[PDB]
Design an enzyme around this catalytic site. Structure first.
Site: not given
Ligand SMILES: Nc1nc2c(ncn2[C@@H]2O[C@H](COP(=O)(O)OP(=O)(O)OP(=O)(O)O)[C@@H](O)[C@H]2O)c(=O)[nH]1
Ligand SMILES: Nc1nc2c(ncn2[C@@H]2O[C@H](COP(=O)(O)OP(=O)(O)O)[C@@H](O)[C@H]2O)c(=O)[nH]1
Ligand SMILES: COc1ccc(N(C)c2cc(=O)oc3ccccc23)cc1O
Ligand SMILES: [Ca+2]
Ligand SMILES: [Mg+2]
Ligand SMILES: [Mg+2]
Lengths: 428, 333, 437, 54
Positions: C10-11, C15, C140, C144-145, C224, C252, C254
């Site tokens: 998603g956005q 970003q 996020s 929605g995505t 942003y 990971l 750990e």
């Protein structure tokens, strides 16, 4: 979700429609021949929402022009931006609808509707990803009202997963053509409640009063009314048309503005209020914009915001201004009036900013409110409907086209339901 | 215009405070659940501190310090005094105390109890008052609740005429900057019946609070002596002042208690701010040594003093954060 | 060496991903074309940075990353951006119609149709791995995505890579920069569906980042871009141990071992210092004691809450720059005596410490001043449950009147999934309360 | 107070300091729920088109 398809139906629909395209073409750098002659990149980045690109390299409005009479559309064609419209998108009959919803919806309109849908289909087929539709029309006549709502129902059948959005001009005795307007409006409201996702209630009562009380125009014309409509229409579509920090489309508008599917009738507002010709030189401060945009006298629907509560509000500020000061003022007006905003929808007031101001202004604010006070509009139409309907006055104009009184009783009940559905959320 | 919400119904102190905020007209009351407030007058029970200071463009203030319950529950207070270097087991102004659980420091209590019985010196304790360890622990178990066992003060200062017991209530307001303000007016909650060294089951002469005193009202209105009369007494009877003999010690105790919890409860660098009104309860013995008994987190006031204090709460705690268009002694923190 | 695949959804995910990969390139000396002059093994390697970058015969260093959005315009920025050559086109995946801020649309309607393609493009990255250890997933809560699609993806990753670790970097919603009124719905729905599938999740509240940018960077109205440059510094601090030589949080597994004793309570609080404006003319450099002390200020946390009124289960300090153990230990000793730090009884009161001598890299022309030393503290404290409390309340407000629910039901979701998600959150709030009071 | 696990390299060091001691759904089930929701969408749409047919 990129392309919007625009439809304008009937005299009012086509007159406010033509003005919308004049205004937004100017804002986007587009001239009457379809040529881009502007100096900002912001003008072109999202131009595909409203314009088709012919190899030209010309920009053609994704706009279909519809009427049951030729008059108004001939006027559009010889009007300022008349040449910009795709000539194949002029779909017109000859007989007119006689201010009669039954003619538009059942008899005369029925005859023309298939060829409109053919034009709708050709535009829809040429879409990367169609958002849905915007219709301009009035509710008080025959074509915009009866045939417009017929189109909506047929568009929904063929495209049930697209958004339907209307700018719907409500009739008023103050600016009235015929006594049957309340009949045509009630029949139409019944349709809008079921088959649109979002509707801007553009109230001719409010437009009249603004022109008279605020703009000091002692005798308002349709032209003066339409100046207010096109400024409002430009404002409410800003976030669909320009790239910003919030990038909107018709579905995201609906999701965020409509908490219950029937309550989708918006009260729009604009500041600063101006007329054509004599315009102010005095620049507006962010506190003045904010105060004015929320004032009853700046609303395009003749309802008192204090007689209800806002479910949701979207506000758009245009021009170079302090976004910090915008945020502060918007928060200020909420924190100082918080009994008028429902407390069970957190963060129900959303603000967006665009750097490009409209023509002739340094800064402006556009208001979109979903308020329970809109019930006042529907109650007013209901009272006017019942005043005639209790004596069956003027009904022969409709029964002559094959309608029954039952259909009037049903549309009245549904509009009264809508009213008490608003009253329900105004208490809690 | 400032906004506020009311979430404690039974609070006489804050009922009067809201009434005062409304009377300036520059304060608007909102409904319980409206989160767009400048000021919360909170509930006593599970107040949602987690939801404060997250409203953009609103400076938010609450009338409780989160964590101040450590000072204001009998079991919590003992633990706090005993475990804090600042206060300690060496602490000379709090009675020897033990936390007692029934389904814990029971063994430490009995060992100290027996050491009191070496040559048998004064061995009377409180939980409700008894002279031997066995009836005390049996009473606690009969409840199914945590309580404190405390060295009962056998030699109180006794008012004459009447051979009467008393406790002092002090009102203390801690503001959002952690200034500690002692309200200049205190109150003595008197007993009306002569103090009885021999009979510990009779409870109207040993227990002093305003309710359990229903011979009532005999010497002063409603069993309440104020500072003017008490100071007068101390001059006439004991050749001292209230300032010298008692208040120095009161100020010391209050300051020590509140400075000790300051790092744990301060809102100095937080996204919301707190203030709170406390009621400290003091015992005075016959050599004029002050002992702390109770800290109350939601005190009521004495009828006579409501107006002045409530106005003071508005002046130093509310208007200091939210200005409009001293009755306190500041204890130097 | 064991590879990590980064997934940006998603956005927000995309970003933030952009900012992280930009920073990662600056730290490892990888140029915008993907060339790394200091890497002497051409076309191959099992160095620590190869955990995040694969190599081509021509010597191009390519992120082990996939970018997915249900709409084209954000990922199009990556396609034509300054870092365009770094990524294979196959790694940049876009649909046509977004989720319209609606979890149900991202999860069911539009999700169902792109899930198989995303999994195929992830499989392509995984086939290039010698011993894939798992996934870092950026998204996020509110989108929605970011909510809907992410929870779908996570479920499927648990099926196709059942042995692999999954970590989240999650943006918690803040009204100041929010895009939707239904974000509280989307947050509770995604957290319920993702909870069993995530091993460790780092929440970043946009409110906290926004205010840090205002207060410490003197940015009047943070964009942003401002937010993400700061977020990417914190993410880099967290992932540095996977990308550089060291002996703490090297894999990971750990992360969970050191930060998550109780599997449902897997949201460590991140606190970062110092944050100093690049426009600040005169700046006195902060010592080990000062930066470490600042790790216990609510104002420097990724989520505003009060750890004095909760309990710690674990705590790592991650230093970058001129820092030696002796100064760390002396700082800790004096902090212990001044601050309210309480561990749960069934855990040691202590700190795992990692030091990397390289100071934080800053983005040229960015808002952050170069500093001689920085620290990120990761603490698993029960105090982070305040954020759940806040969110659950906002959810309850709307849901009591069923406001907006029809938009989700109309995408094929059942009403019962709301109360199911919400009951799980109620149990989560209880878990935190049982552990912490 | 007690410093354990001291590990040093060219790039940095790590250690532990102890202040005080102590005291899935299947691929089948997923496709099921995705298809169930798609069926609710088809049905609600069929209900719409029937109403429009009337
Ligand atoms: N910190 C940060 N937050 C962002 C960014 N972009 C969006 N957000 C936040 O994420 C939430 C909105 O979700 P988005 O990620 O924009 O939505 P999406 O996942 O693309 O889903 P759609 O609804 O399909 O557009 C809001 O709370 C935003 O404030 C970003 O670049 N940085
Ligand atoms: N605001 C506005 N209202 C109009 C305009 N033209 C007509 N109306 C109103 O529209 C209604 C009549 O509908 P009209 O569009 O003329 O009839 P149609 O051609 O059959 O759709 C009445 O309520 C008129 O007040 C216009 O240009 N602007
Ligand atoms: C009540 O909360 C919200 C209301 C609306 C919106 N969105 C998506 C808008 C879309 C749009 O076309 O115009 C806008 C202009 C100004 C502000 C928002 C919108 C988002 C929200 O959170
Ligand atoms: Ca190599
Ligand atoms: Mg007409
Ligand atoms: Mg998106």
């Amino acid at each position: 979700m990129r392309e919007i398809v625009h439809i304008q139906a009937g005299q009012c629909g086509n007159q406010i429609g033509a003005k919308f395209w004049e205004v937004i073409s100017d804002e986007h750098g587009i001239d009457p021949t379809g040529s881009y002659h502007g100096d900002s990149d912001l003008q072109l980045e999202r131009i595909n929402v409203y314009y088709n690109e012919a190899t030209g390299n010309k920009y053609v409005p994704r706009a279909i022009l519809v009427d049951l009479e030729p008059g108004t559309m001939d006027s559009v064609r010889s009007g300022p931006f008349g040449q910009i419209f795709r000539p194949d998108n002029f779909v017109f009959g000859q007989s007119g609808a006689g201010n009669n919803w039954a003619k538009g919806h059942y008899t005369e309109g029925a005859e023309l509707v298939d060829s409109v849908l053919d034009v709708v289909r050709k535009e829809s087929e040429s879409c990367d990803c169609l958002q849905g539709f915007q219709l301009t029309h009035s509710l008080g006549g025959g074509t915009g009202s009866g045939m417009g709502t017929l189109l909506i129902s047929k568009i929904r059948e063929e495209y049930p997963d697209r958004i339907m959005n209307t700018f719907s001009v409500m009739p008023s005795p103050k600016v009235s053509d015929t006594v049957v307007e309340p009949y045509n409006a009630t029949l139409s409201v019944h349709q809008l409640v079921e088959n649109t996702d979002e509707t801007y209630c553009i109230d001719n009562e409010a437009l009249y009063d603004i022109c008279f009380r605020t703009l000091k125009l002692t005798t308002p014309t349709y032209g003066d009314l339409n100046h207010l409509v096109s400024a409002t229409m430009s404002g409410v579509t800003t976030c669909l048309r320009f790239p910003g920090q919030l990038n909107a489309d018709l579905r995201k508008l609906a999701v965020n503005m409509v908490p219950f599917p029937r309550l989708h009738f918006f009260m729009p507002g604009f500041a600063p209020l101006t007329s054509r010709g004599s315009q102010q030189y005095r620049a507006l401060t962010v506190p003045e914009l904010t105060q004015q945009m929320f004032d009853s006298k700046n609303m395009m629907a003749a309802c008192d915001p204090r007689h209800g509560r806002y479910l949701t509000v979207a506000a758009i500020f245009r021009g170079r201004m302090s976004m910090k000061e915008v945020d502060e003022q918007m928060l200020n007006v909420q924190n100082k009036n918080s009994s008028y905003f429902v407390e069970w929808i957190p963060n129900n007031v959303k603000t967006a900013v665009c750097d490009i101001p409209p023509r002739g202004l340094k800064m402006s604010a556009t208001f979109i409110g979903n308020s329970t006070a809109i019930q006042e509009l529907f109650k007013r139409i209901s009272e006017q409907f019942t005043a005639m309907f209790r004596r069956k006055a003027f009904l022969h104009w409709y029964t002559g086209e094959g309608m029954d009184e039952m259909e009037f009783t049903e549309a009245e009940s549904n509009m009264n339901d809508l009213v008490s559905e608003y009253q329900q959320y105004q208490d809690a | 215009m400032y906004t506020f919400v009311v979430r404690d119904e039974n609070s006489s102190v804050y009922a009067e405070v809201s009434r005062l905020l409304l009377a300036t007209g520059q304060w608007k009351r909102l409904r319980k659940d409206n989160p767009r407030f400048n000021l919360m007058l909170g509930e006593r029970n599970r107040l949602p501190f987690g939801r404060l200071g997250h409203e953009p463009g609103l400076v938010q203030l609450v009338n409780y310090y989160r964590g101040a319950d450590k000072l204001c529950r009998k079991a919590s207070l003992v633990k706090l005094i005993k475990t804090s270097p600042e206060l300690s087991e060496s602490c000379t102004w709090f009675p020897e105390s033990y936390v007692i659980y029934p389904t814990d420091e029971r063994e430490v209590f009995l060992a100290a109890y027996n050491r009191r019985r070496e040559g048998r010196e004064g061995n009377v304790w409180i939980a409700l008052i008894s002279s031997e360890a066995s009836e005390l622990l049996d009473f606690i178990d009969e409840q199914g609740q945590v309580h404190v066992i405390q060295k009962y003060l056998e030699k109180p200062l006794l008012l004459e005429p009447g051979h009467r017991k008393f406790d002092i209530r002090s009102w203390v307001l801690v503001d959002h900057l952690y200034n500690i303000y002692l309200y200049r007016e205190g109150v003595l909650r008197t007993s009306s019946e002569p103090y009885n060294s021999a009979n510990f089951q009779d409870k109207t002469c040993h227990l002093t609070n305003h309710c359990i005193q229903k011979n009532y009202g005999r010497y002063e209105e409603g069993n309440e002596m104020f500072f003017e009369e008490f100071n007068q007494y101390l001059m006439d009877a004991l050749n001292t002042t209230l300032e010298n003999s008692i208040l120095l010690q009161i100020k010391h105790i209050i300051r020590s208690c509140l400075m000790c919890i300051e790092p744990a409860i301060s809102t100095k660098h937080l996204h919301y701010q707190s203030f709170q009104l406390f009621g400290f309860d003091f015992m005075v013995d016959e050599e004029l040594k002050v002992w702390l008994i109770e800290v109350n987190g939601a005190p009521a006031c004495a009828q006579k003093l409501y107006a002045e204090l409530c106005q003071g709460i508005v002046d130093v705690a509310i208007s200091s954060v939210f200005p409009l268009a001293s009755i306190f002694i500041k204890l130097h923190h | 060496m064991r590879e990590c695949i980064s997934i940006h959804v998603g956005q927000a995910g995309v970003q933030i991903g952009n900012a992280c990969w930009e920073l990662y390139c600056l730290e490892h000396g990888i140029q915008p074309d993907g060339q790394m002059p200091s890497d002497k093994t051409i076309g191959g390697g099992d160095d620590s940075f190869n955990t995040f970058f694969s190599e081509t015969g021509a010597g191009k260093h390519v992120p082990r990353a996939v970018f997915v959005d249900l709409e084209p315009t954000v990922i199009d920025e990556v396609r034509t951006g300054t870092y365009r050559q770094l990524f294979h086109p196959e790694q940049l995946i876009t649909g046509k119609e977004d989720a319209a801020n609606n979890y149900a649309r991202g999860h069911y309607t539009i999700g169902k149709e792109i899930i198989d393609l995303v999994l195929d493009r992830i499989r392509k990255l995984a086939d290039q791995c010698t011993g894939l250890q798992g996934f870092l997933v950026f998204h996020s809560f509110g989108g929605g995505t970011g909510s809907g699609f992410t929870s779908l993806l996570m479920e499927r990753l648990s099926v196709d890579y059942g042995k692999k670790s999954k970590l989240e970097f999650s943006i918690y919603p803040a009204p100041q920069v929010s895009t939707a009124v239904v974000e509280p719905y989307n947050s509770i729905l995604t957290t319920h569906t993702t909870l069993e599938h995530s091993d460790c999740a780092f929440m970043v509240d946009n409110e906290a980042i926004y205010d840090i940018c205002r207060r410490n960077l003197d940015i009047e109205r943070p964009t942003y871009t401002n937010l993400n440059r700061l977020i990417s510094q914190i993410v880099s601090s967290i992932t540095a141990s996977l990308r550089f030589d060291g002996a703490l949080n090297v894999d990971l597994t750990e992360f969970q071992t050191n930060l998550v004793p109780y599997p449902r309570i897997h949201f460590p609080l991140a606190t970062y210092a110092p944050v100093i404006s690049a426009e600040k003319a005169y700046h006195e450099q902060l010592s080990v004691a000062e930066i470490t002390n600042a790790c216990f200020e609510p104002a420097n946390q990724m989520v505003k809450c009060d750890p004095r009124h909760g309990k710690y289960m674990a705590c790592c300090l991650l230093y970058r720059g001129d820092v030696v153990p002796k100064d760390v230990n002396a700082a800790i000793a004096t902090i212990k005596t001044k601050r309210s730090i309480q561990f749960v009884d069934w855990c040691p009161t202590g700190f795992k410490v990692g030091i990397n001598y390289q100071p934080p890299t800053v983005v040229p022309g960015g808002d952050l001043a170069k500093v001689q030393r920085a620290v990120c503290m990761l603490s698993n404290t029960t105090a982070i449950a305040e954020a759940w409390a806040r969110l659950d309340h906002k959810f309850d407000l709307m849901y009591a009147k069923r406001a907006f629910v029809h938009w989700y039901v109309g995408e094929g979701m059942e009403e019962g999934e709301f109360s199911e998600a919400r009951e799980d959150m109620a149990a989560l709030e209880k878990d935190y309360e049982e552990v912490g009071v | 107070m007690e410093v354990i696990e001291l590990n040093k390299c060219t790039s940095g060091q790590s250690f532990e300091v102890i202040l005080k001691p102590p005291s899935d759904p299947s691929l089948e089930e997923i496709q099921k729920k995705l298809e169930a929701a798609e069926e609710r969408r088809k049905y609600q749409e069929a209900e719409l088109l029937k109403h429009l047919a009337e």
